[PDB]
């Protein structure tokens, strides 16, 4: 017998493959499973893990997020890498010339990148002009902006969003939300 100091037969708790059965995402995993196993480049190991992520773990990257990252000092000609969908932003006043590699482009995003003199390439095209991800810059979308996160960790004096179907003066505003109605939490 053994006095176990840790739980036995515990899975790692990380995705080792996409949950998706899309064969074309699998081909991308095929390529970066080989790259992460053989280049010693930390970029390729990050990309392989990011290809496994679920939809909420790869939030969309607006074309505005890429613009601010390209506005970093000495990052104007870097290659923007988005493991996910790049969406359009009709609130932008202008977009630069840039090379962006993404899983997917929206119609507005593809139009805008090419309209301003840039390139919209896929992640396999990235692996030939940058097999070690040289002079790249990975952009991730906001994770805590999701609507479901509004209600996470709800409680007294927690300031989170109640799980409610209707909004108005008659819906969860009287007792427990007001000192004139007892207490406020």
């Amino acid at each position: 017998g053994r006095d176990h100091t840790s739980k036995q037969h515990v899975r790692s708790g990380h995705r080792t493959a996409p949950k998706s059965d899309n064969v074309y995402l699998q081909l991308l995993v095929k390529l970066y499973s080989f790259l992460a196993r053989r280049t010693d480049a930390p970029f390729n190991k990050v990309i392989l893990k990011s290809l496994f992520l679920s939809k909420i773990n790869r939030p969309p990257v607006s074309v505005s997020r890429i613009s601010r990252a390209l506005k970093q000092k000495g990052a104007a000609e870097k290659t923007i890498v988005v493991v996910g969908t790049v969406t359009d932003d009709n609130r932008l006043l202008e977009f630069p010339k840039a090379t962006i590699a993404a899983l997917r482009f929206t119609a507005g995003a593809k139009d805008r990148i090419l309209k301003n003199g840039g390139e919209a390439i896929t992640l396999d095209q990235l692996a030939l002009r940058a097999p070690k991800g040289q002079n790249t810059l990975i952009v991730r979308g906001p994770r805590n902006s999701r609507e479901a996160v509004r209600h996470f960790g709800f409680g007294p004096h927690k300031g989170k969003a109640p799980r409610i179907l209707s909004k108005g003066r008659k819906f969860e505003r009287a007792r427990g939300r007001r000192r004139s109605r007892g207490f406020k939490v």
Partner: protein, 234 residues
Amino acid sequence: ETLQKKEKAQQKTAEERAAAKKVRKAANKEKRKVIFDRAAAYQKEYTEAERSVIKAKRDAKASNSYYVDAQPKLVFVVRIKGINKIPPKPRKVLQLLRLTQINAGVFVRLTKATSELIKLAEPYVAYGYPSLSTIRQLVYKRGFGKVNKQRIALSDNAIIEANLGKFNILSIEDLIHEIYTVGPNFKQVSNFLWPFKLSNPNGGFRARKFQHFIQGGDTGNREQFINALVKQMN
């Protein structure tokens, strides 16, 4: 014609392997001379220390004095109690000693912190002061290293060098010397060593184990009789 292709590849890679092994053996000959010299020096200093202690005892006897031995700096602790019904504090102490099964053995450098640790685990372990031959036999027969959190047999000095060369341990005898005369890198060498998984004694225990060695049991400090106990169990 793949027969001749694979035969050519095998003979070419065999020739390259032969040349590389020639060079490797020539380079390793010097390393083996180094470890030979180290082992001879260790034997010489063991003998010198023994004879020095013997001479000091004889001189103190002659000069109307009493030679008081240096207190032991090393102890070997064997968990002889099963894994059921252990209070949380001695359980944590046994876990921190890497004694998580019966008949598991570990090397401990005697100070105050570790002494109070072993005192907490005392009702569940048998420990004592190991001799050089006991350490050698333990490391030779049941010596394993922790390599990438795996228990690997110590079957070649390259494993020891690859894991303890930054601590100046290049051989199994370097490791044994570092353990016996408690050295500056005792911590790293003993933690690299997987806990020894001993058998039960050939000849049995005493009639009742779970009482102190002083009271006719098996737990506590038996000192030089740890060698007999290890002889029974290894």
